[PDB]
Scaffold this active site. Sequence first.
Site, PDB file in Angstrom:
ATOM      1  N   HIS A 146       1.177   5.357  -2.218  1.00 22.63           N
ATOM      2  CA  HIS A 146       0.589   6.300  -3.175  1.00 22.63           C
ATOM      3  C   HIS A 146       1.729   6.949  -3.971  1.00 22.63           C
ATOM      4  O   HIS A 146       2.304   7.962  -3.563  1.00 22.63           O
ATOM      5  CB  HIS A 146      -0.249   7.363  -2.445  1.00 22.63           C
ATOM      6  CG  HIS A 146      -1.430   6.800  -1.716  1.00 22.63           C
ATOM      7  ND1 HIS A 146      -2.724   6.919  -2.180  1.00 22.63           N
ATOM      8  CD2 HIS A 146      -1.509   6.080  -0.572  1.00 22.63           C
ATOM      9  CE1 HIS A 146      -3.545   6.294  -1.355  1.00 22.63           C
ATOM     10  NE2 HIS A 146      -2.834   5.774  -0.370  1.00 22.63           N
TER      11      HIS A 146
ATOM     12  N   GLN B 106     -10.442   8.695  -4.632  1.00 24.81           N
ATOM     13  CA  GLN B 106     -10.145   9.441  -3.409  1.00 24.81           C
ATOM     14  C   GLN B 106     -11.251  10.324  -2.862  1.00 24.81           C
ATOM     15  O   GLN B 106     -11.378  10.470  -1.640  1.00 24.81           O
ATOM     16  CB  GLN B 106      -8.865  10.270  -3.619  1.00 24.81           C
ATOM     17  CG  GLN B 106      -8.486  11.217  -2.473  1.00 24.81           C
ATOM     18  CD  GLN B 106      -7.888  10.508  -1.265  1.00 24.81           C
ATOM     19  OE1 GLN B 106      -6.669  10.329  -1.171  1.00 24.81           O
ATOM     20  NE2 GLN B 106      -8.747  10.096  -0.337  1.00 24.81           N
TER      21      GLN B 106
ATOM     22  N   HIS C 203       0.808  -1.221   0.000  1.00 22.64           N
ATOM     23  CA  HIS C 203       0.000   0.000   0.000  1.00 22.64           C
ATOM     24  C   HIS C 203       0.839   1.267   0.000  1.00 22.64           C
ATOM     25  O   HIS C 203       1.381   1.664   1.037  1.00 22.64           O
ATOM     26  CB  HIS C 203      -0.920   0.000   1.241  1.00 22.64           C
ATOM     27  CG  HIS C 203      -1.949   1.097   1.261  1.00 22.64           C
ATOM     28  ND1 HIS C 203      -3.292   0.852   1.465  1.00 22.64           N
ATOM     29  CD2 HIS C 203      -1.830   2.445   1.162  1.00 22.64           C
ATOM     30  CE1 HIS C 203      -3.951   1.998   1.489  1.00 22.64           C
ATOM     31  NE2 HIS C 203      -3.088   2.981   1.306  1.00 22.64           N
TER      32      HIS C 203
ATOM     33  N   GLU D 150     -11.058   4.251   7.545  1.00 26.14           N
ATOM     34  CA  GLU D 150      -9.837   4.930   8.019  1.00 26.14           C
ATOM     35  C   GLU D 150     -10.299   6.187   8.769  1.00 26.14           C
ATOM     36  O   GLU D 150     -10.177   7.319   8.284  1.00 26.14           O
ATOM     37  CB  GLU D 150      -8.907   5.314   6.858  1.00 26.14           C
ATOM     38  CG  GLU D 150      -7.541   5.813   7.346  1.00 26.14           C
ATOM     39  CD  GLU D 150      -6.671   6.401   6.251  1.00 26.14           C
ATOM     40  OE1 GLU D 150      -5.516   6.791   6.558  1.00 26.14           O
ATOM     41  OE2 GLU D 150      -7.129   6.487   5.088  1.00 26.14           O
TER      42      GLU D 150
ATOM     43  N   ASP E   6       2.375   3.360   2.960  1.00 22.33           N
ATOM     44  CA  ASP E   6       1.298   4.293   2.605  1.00 22.33           C
ATOM     45  C   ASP E   6       1.803   5.575   1.926  1.00 22.33           C
ATOM     46  O   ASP E   6       1.622   5.734   0.716  1.00 22.33           O
ATOM     47  CB  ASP E   6       0.428   4.596   3.838  1.00 22.33           C
ATOM     48  CG  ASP E   6      -0.956   5.136   3.478  1.00 22.33           C
ATOM     49  OD1 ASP E   6      -1.715   5.438   4.421  1.00 22.33           O
ATOM     50  OD2 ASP E   6      -1.298   5.242   2.277  1.00 22.33           O
TER      51      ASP E   6
ATOM     52  N   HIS F  39     -10.021   1.497   0.756  1.00 27.20           N
ATOM     53  CA  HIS F  39      -9.536   2.315   1.890  1.00 27.20           C
ATOM     54  C   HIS F  39     -10.789   2.204   2.791  1.00 27.20           C
ATOM     55  O   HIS F  39     -11.803   2.885   2.561  1.00 27.20           O
ATOM     56  CB  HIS F  39      -9.277   3.765   1.468  1.00 27.20           C
ATOM     57  CG  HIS F  39      -7.872   4.018   1.005  1.00 27.20           C
ATOM     58  ND1 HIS F  39      -7.360   3.496  -0.166  1.00 27.20           N
ATOM     59  CD2 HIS F  39      -6.866   4.731   1.568  1.00 27.20           C
ATOM     60  CE1 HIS F  39      -6.102   3.880  -0.301  1.00 27.20           C
ATOM     61  NE2 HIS F  39      -5.776   4.631   0.739  1.00 27.20           N
TER      62      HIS F  39
HETATM   63  O1  LIG Z   1      -7.588   8.205   1.755  1.00 27.70           O
HETATM   64  C1  LIG Z   1      -6.351   8.227   1.850  1.00 27.70           C
HETATM   65  N1  LIG Z   1      -5.453   8.774   0.908  1.00 27.70           N
HETATM   66  C2  LIG Z   1      -4.008   8.774   1.087  1.00 27.70           C
HETATM   67  C3  LIG Z   1      -3.456   8.235   2.184  1.00 27.70           C
HETATM   68  F1  LIG Z   1      -2.149   8.238   2.379  1.00 27.70           F
HETATM   69  C4  LIG Z   1      -4.322   7.651   3.171  1.00 27.70           C
HETATM   70  O2  LIG Z   1      -3.976   6.198   2.989  1.00 27.70           O
HETATM   71  N2  LIG Z   1      -5.737   7.679   2.958  1.00 27.70           N
HETATM   72 FE   LIG Z   2      -3.613   4.970   1.341  1.00 29.29          FE
END
Ligand SMILES: O=C1NC=C(F)[C@H](O)N1
Ligand SMILES: [Fe+3]
Lengths: 423, 423
Positions: A60, A153, A58, A214, A310, A211
């Site tokens: 980005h 997102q 995981h 969270e 992450d 996701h």
């Molecule tokens: O919704 C999210 N976007 C980016 C992140 F780093 C986090 O994991 N959550």
């Molecule tokens: Fe993430």
Amino acid sequence: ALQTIINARLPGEEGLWQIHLQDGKISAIDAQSGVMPITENSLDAEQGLVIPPFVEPHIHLDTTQTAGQPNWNQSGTLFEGIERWAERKALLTHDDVKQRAWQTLKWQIANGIQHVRTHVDVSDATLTALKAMLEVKQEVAPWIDLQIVAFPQEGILSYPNGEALLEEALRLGADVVGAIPHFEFTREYGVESLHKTFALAQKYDRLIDVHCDEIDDEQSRFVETVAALAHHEGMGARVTASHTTAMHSYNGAYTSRLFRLLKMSGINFVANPLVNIHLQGRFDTYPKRRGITRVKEMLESGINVCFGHDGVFDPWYPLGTANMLQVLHMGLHVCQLMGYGQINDGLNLITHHSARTLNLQDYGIAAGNSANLIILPAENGFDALRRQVPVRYSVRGGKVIASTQPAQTTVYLEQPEAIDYKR
Amino acid sequence: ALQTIINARLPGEEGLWQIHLQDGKISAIDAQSGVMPITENSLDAEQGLVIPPFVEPHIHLDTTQTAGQPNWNQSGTLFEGIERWAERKALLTHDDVKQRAWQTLKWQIANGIQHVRTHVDVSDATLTALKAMLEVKQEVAPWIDLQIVAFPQEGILSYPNGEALLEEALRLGADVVGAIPHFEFTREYGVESLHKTFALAQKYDRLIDVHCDEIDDEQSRFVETVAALAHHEGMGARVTASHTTAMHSYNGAYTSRLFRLLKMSGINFVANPLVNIHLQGRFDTYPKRRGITRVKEMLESGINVCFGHDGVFDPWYPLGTANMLQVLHMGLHVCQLMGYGQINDGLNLITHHSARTLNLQDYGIAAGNSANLIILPAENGFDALRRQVPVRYSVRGGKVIASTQPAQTTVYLEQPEAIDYKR
Ligand SMILES: O=C1NC=C(F)[C@H](O)N1
Ligand SMILES: [Fe+3]
Ligand SMILES: O=C1NC=C(F)[C@H](O)N1
Ligand SMILES: [Fe+3]
């Protein structure tokens, strides 16, 4: 080319082992009764640990290296992070994304990571980052197998044309369908968004990585829908629930009921320790909750859980060198997996468990598999973790793709003495 | 011998600086307008960061390297740790203690630590570890200034002859008077033990460092007595409250009232991130509190707070390489000191603030001070912390006492490329 890896220690096994290589694959694995001599075509593990490659389940890569651009996430929360990212997303260019993604990918190669799953924000009509990442995937293929998650997102139902854009991303080649139910405007949109996610995954035969919950909200229970839909469709192996930080705040009775379904469903879980300890607990004063999902209990129940980094210098995380042993170190401390065996077995959280999360079909030190393996200059998982050792050699297809000559430390006492921090 | 340190960056200062050395001291510090050429007798910081030495304000060298002997602390709690230590304490020998203490001290020298405060358990009629440590203090003096705290681990009033043994330890030369009020049988013994501790510190002109409220009990408020007695005696600079983890669980109104006294008193605080995240929160199910004292609020209020490692492979901590940047990394995450400036200024928590805690009189890069300094191969505190850099050179009395040739990492892409994890 290399024909053998000698003097290798293997997790959970006693003694030393020799790994024979042929045509880019592992042909056989044989035990040694002592130390073998080096020779040309033999890579000497020097009684260090040999494991399949580290995995990043995981990250980005579309946001990596953008922290502070154009503004910083002052509150250190998920919500402000998304707002700061929105500002940066409006400034994206094809080359911008490729250059930043490649910078972090090189750190990953250096760190023995040969499998990476990157989420890419597809709440963007231009799909700028996705188009760039699809090119990066092809370019980095000789060193890393990159999976791309089409990550909506800003929501599927809560963003203009969200569902159409999510499907467009799959039609362009994204490997995994993402979702973010707790960010949708309502609980109903959250649940509905998951039905849409599963329908798309079945329509295109793709994996799922949500996701999921969270948020420090004891009422955020989207994970039960993710697990139930996976069970109904008989596709648990292809499904992952990332984060599930809300689970840290659930009452124990509901959690016990839920765990039966989690196990039956066969879905995977990703915890992101470095980011979770930073972003969670931000609405508490004191005491402050840790906010990581129930990793220890998942392990005790046989539920597959693993760790991701992450963010690497992005809106949700100002630090990082994309190092999985560092991620593991944080997770073991925050999750209180501090018994000797728990620490020693920690490597599973950044190797085998993560490979299962990515549904990998060619992973592990086993005859017939591709010769993809790394060598750590340590005696076992505990030692590697304690000393935060680098990757001495990374081998892919039977060829060395990265190597690190360890640092050399000397103290000048009555006589000079080399220090290796071992006992 | 060395005459100058050139091309040095200094925290909070712009540009590069030259540090002139004479007779083992810093004679002058001058700004440079560009990069200076190397020459014999000049140590080139190579645009890296030069800081006074790292400090370890709280460690247990008598227990270091004994984890699992004869048994492991299964629950991961302070209480079981003390019981496991009691079993090991009965097996102590003079040479045993000296050898283990020296092993960890060498790691500290390698890590640029030139000042260390070790607690030594004096709840032992034989005072075996104390006698050994007093010899170690003399032996390690050329490299580390070691302070010894007479630590009555099993209580002053709650252990047979506890007060007599505490005083005996001071008469033998311990530098600091310790206490552990929350471990005493009753609140009244806790408060009384502090009056006795302060009386001994004034009788012998010694410093004070109390293991204070290391418990997730919102009613453990011994810190107010430590601060009030220090204020009454006008000796705040000489007093330290270690841990104060109970403060993580106090209501905000009491904490606000308390903070006025903490500031007025001038006492010091030590937080031990690696151990606190592991031992605290063990009686919670979920959610689970972090358990570190109010570091962020102390910094905002101008109250001196710093970080210690506490244990290095002992009953209370199964890991460690005695690395202060690693301790700092954990603390910044758990305390949510994750803003760019907060991270960059983090070095203060393991340098200047710790020197103040130890009441050091010769510390800092300033004319007239001993030439004790270290060089980090990083641009600033943020960079050093992010990349967990080693200490390139440690200089004491104007002489190099430790050096680390950094690791060299290469990735083999279409062409070989060196990776330094910088941007
Ligand atoms: O919704 C999210 N976007 C980016 C992140 F780093 C986090 O994991 N959550
Ligand atoms: Fe993430
Ligand atoms: O009372 C204590 N003894 C030893 C420790 F490591 C912990 O700091 N607390
Ligand atoms: Fe301690």
